[PDB]
Structure 1
Amino acid sequence: KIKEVKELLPPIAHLYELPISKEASGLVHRTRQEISDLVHGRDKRLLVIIGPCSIHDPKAALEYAERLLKLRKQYENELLIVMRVYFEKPRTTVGWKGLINDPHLDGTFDINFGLRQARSLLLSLNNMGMPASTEFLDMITPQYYADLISWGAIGARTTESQVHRELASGLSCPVGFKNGTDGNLKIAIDAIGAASHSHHFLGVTKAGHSAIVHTGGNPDCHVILRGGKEPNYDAEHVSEAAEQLRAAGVTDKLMIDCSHANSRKDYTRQMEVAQDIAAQLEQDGGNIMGVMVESHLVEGRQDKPEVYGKSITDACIGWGATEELLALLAGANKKRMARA
């Protein structure tokens, strides 16, 4: 039941063509620290992971980045803005898995090219001053570009998975674990516990050979509230999450996803969620360290990549709505930071 096995270039090949620049290296290292500070309550800025549900077009992604960069800089004292640069998508059943798996968007599975494109995009983003985030779904691909990533997500469908927790335990960036598809938070709390410890498992080296990897633990993990059978973004759900986190002795600072099961897949509700968060930040909101927003140049979605700057996976808010949502959150958090 295996059709074929094909030639794969090892990470060192891509690392040779596209070595990390000093300026990229500095941004990554820096943003990781900054985020770690948010995770552990040492800085009260709000982390904002924002951008497309998935990258299908580097040029659009670069243009998006350039716009977002101005706002990253403008709001830098209230918000820590990092771009969503997602290359791997977990499907409910089957479908396009992302740019790495099939970069020509036609069923050709040109993975060598996909991995090259993903590294290239990430390098250009970091070079221009925009840090990047992604969902780490595969066990092997991260060796190809993890060095360019400032923050990582483990998805709702894999938070419970031991191999994903293992993976997170060895990543050098902070990591967010989503609650489960039906709303189970415990699995994410458990995942932080697990990922913070040392693990031994089989992995693949930068030279494309299998090996035993021994990780040191990732101390910068946190939970992401992304809704379930019902939304879990409000104050009450946040307060209950926080108590459970303190109970298991892990960080009670969390991220709230404005999209997915919290917006019920209606991109026009992301603003409502952000409005609720804004209010929580104004009243108290002490347990919130970040938010997640799926955002693009052009709002909505499409099945085929016909329109530029428009998602082919989950529907996104457009650029206008994005400017508004960011100003809303910046304003709200400026007040939270002023209180102490």
Structure 2
Amino acid sequence: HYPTDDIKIKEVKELLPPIAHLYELPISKEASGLVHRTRQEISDLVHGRDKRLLVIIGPCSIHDPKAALEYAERLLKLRKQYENELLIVMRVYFEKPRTTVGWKGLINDPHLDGTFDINFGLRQARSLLLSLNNMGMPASTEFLDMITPQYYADLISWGAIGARTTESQVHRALASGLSCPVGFKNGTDGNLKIAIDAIGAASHSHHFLSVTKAGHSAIVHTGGNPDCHVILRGGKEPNYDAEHVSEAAEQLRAAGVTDKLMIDCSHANSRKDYTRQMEVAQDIAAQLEQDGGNIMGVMVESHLVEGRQDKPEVYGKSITDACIGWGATEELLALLAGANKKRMAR
């Protein structure tokens, strides 16, 4: 026999099943209530029943749980303070997806050394998400595959599908069965249609392969997800301004799906310059003051210390994309709370 199986595989290793983590870290009654309620409050925004602004805000990536928890303490106070204008949810992303050289994130490589201790990574991820919900901070994350959600999606109040997978049929099928509302990014070249098609698709029932809670190969049958929306993240040019929002809203209505959308203040819309997220937020603030009816949320990349570093030396500073520091965070949130108070008052 010539070999034909696993020719280009170095190793296949068993992971602990979801249920091993769920046994160690069950969702508490209070975390359950927060997640349940936060998903519902987000649905209300997606569907225009409430005019608060959803704000997904936090580090580009989580590389330190201690810092993430300190960040969440500071954020919670503003969450509460602005609760009538803003719905603040912490950004809890474990990786920056690069199909290239670079750290593969906290789940895949928690030790930051290339050892791929994924059992530890998943444990740490779940543990942080549970501690967050327990202190009263809801969590948001991006789902990159069809298996990881079984480990922690019970703790997630809002989920993202990235620009590179929005068109993927199987990722649309995943979104159709996510317990949380889901945002779809427009394409890497600014293509809106793939995200608009994604919202329609994810509303329907699908089948996809995954694993049971007990860790075994499975077929999953979804019910559909009515709570999906687009996320404007730039493309050929930035797409956050009134003209781009109006055009997207127009296309959304034509497709018969929600014309309420979210705008990334970071990444391509800021020209990959953290000091310009404020610029985008100010533009958004002005929209909310003039009208801004089609805006239901924004995303901001924020951390305890501004900027970036390429190794984790400075506490609370990003090792992936540069973030605004805490001072600028307070200023940006005050700005959007002020502006949206006026919108809501009409």
Q: Same fold (TM over 0.5)?
A: yes
**CA deviation profile, 1:19-56 (whole Å, cap 9, x unmatched):** 00000000000000000000000000000000000000
Residue in 2 that maps onto 1:33: 40
Query: What is the DSSP-based 3-state SS (H/G/I as helix, E as strand, rest coil) of the residue aligned with 1:331?
Result: helix
Query: What is the DSSP-based 3-state SS (H/G/I as helix, E as strand, rest coil) of the residue aligned with 1:133?
Result: strand
Residue in 2 that maps onto 1:242: 249
> Are the counterparts in 2 of residues 85 and 133 from structure 1 also a CA contact under 8 Å?
yes
Give the deviation of 1:203 after TM superposition: 1.5
> Are the counterparts in 2 of residues 228 and 261 from structure 1 also a CA contact under 8 Å?
yes
> Are the counterparts in 2 of residues 48 and 80 from structure 1 also a CA contact under 8 Å?
yes
Give the deviation of 1:163 after TM superposition: 1.3
Give the deviation of 1:6 after TM superposition: 1.4
Separation of aligned partners in 1, 2:247 and 2:146: 32
> Are the counterparts in 2 of residues 27 and 126 from structure 1 also a CA contact under 8 Å?
yes
Query: What is the DSSP-based 3-state SS (H/G/I as helix, E as strand, rest coil) of the residue aligned with 1:230?
Result: coil
Query: What is the DSSP-based 3-state SS (H/G/I as helix, E as strand, rest coil) of the residue aligned with 1:156?
Result: coil
Query: What is the DSSP-based 3-state SS (H/G/I as helix, E as strand, rest coil) of the residue aligned with 1:252?
Result: coil
**CA deviation profile, 1:228-274 (whole Å, cap 9, x unmatched):** 12100000000000000000000000000000110011000000000
**Percent identical residues:** 99
Residue in 2 that maps onto 1:299: 306
Separation of aligned partners in 2, 1:296 and 1:202: 36
Separation of aligned partners in 2, 1:97 and 1:151: 22
Q: 4+ residue stretches of structure 1 with deviation over 3 A?
A: none
Query: What is the DSSP-based 3-state SS (H/G/I as helix, E as strand, rest coil) of the residue aligned with 1:286?
Result: coil
Separation of aligned partners in 1, 2:212 and 2:61: 27
Q: 2:28 aligns with which of 13, 16, 21?
A: 21
> Are the counterparts in 2 of residues 88 and 137 from structure 1 also a CA contact under 8 Å?
no
What TM-score do the two structures reach when normalised by structure 2?
0.97
> Are the counterparts in 2 of residues 302 and 312 from structure 1 also a CA contact under 8 Å?
yes
Separation of aligned partners in 2, 1:169 and 1:124: 27
Query: What is the DSSP-based 3-state SS (H/G/I as helix, E as strand, rest coil) of the residue aligned with 1:120?
Result: helix
Give the deviation of 1:171 after TM superposition: 0.4
Query: What is the DSSP-based 3-state SS (H/G/I as helix, E as strand, rest coil) of the residue aligned with 1:100?
Result: helix
Give the deviation of 1:201 after TM superposition: 1.7
> Are the counterparts in 1 of residues 203 and 224 from structure 2 also a CA contact under 8 Å?
yes
What pairs with 1:113-262 in structure 2 (closer than 5 Å)? 113-262=120-269
Separation of aligned partners in 1, 2:166 and 2:330: 31
Separation of aligned partners in 2, 1:52 and 1:66: 14
Gapped regions of structure 2 (runs ≥ 5) = 1-7
Separation of aligned partners in 2, 1:192 and 1:166: 11
Separation of aligned partners in 2, 1:3 and 1:278: 51
> Are the counterparts in 2 of residues 89 and 137 from structure 1 also a CA contact under 8 Å?
no
Give the deviation of 1:89 after TM superposition: 2.6
Gapped regions of structure 1 (runs ≥ 5) = none
Separation of aligned partners in 2, 1:94 and 1:335: 46
> Are the counterparts in 1 of residues 146 and 209 from structure 2 also a CA contact under 8 Å?
no
Answering whether residue 19 of structure 2 is matched by residue 12 of structure 1, we say yes
Query: What is the DSSP-based 3-state SS (H/G/I as helix, E as strand, rest coil) of the residue aligned with 1:80?
Result: strand
**CA deviation profile, 1:100-148 (whole Å, cap 9, x unmatched):** 0000000000000000000000000000000000000121111000000
- When the two chains are superposed, the root-mean-square deviation of aligned CA atoms in Å is 0.7
Pairs aligned (count) = 339
> Are the counterparts in 2 of residues 296 and 318 from structure 1 also a CA contact under 8 Å?
yes
Give the deviation of 1:198 after TM superposition: 0.4
Give the deviation of 1:9 after TM superposition: 0.1
**CA deviation profile, 1:287-330 (whole Å, cap 9, x unmatched):** 00000000000001111111110111111000000000000000
Residue in 2 that maps onto 1:107: 114
Give the deviation of 1:88 after TM superposition: 3.3
Give the deviation of 1:92 after TM superposition: 4.7
Is 329-338 or 132-141 further displaced after alignment?
Answer: 132-141
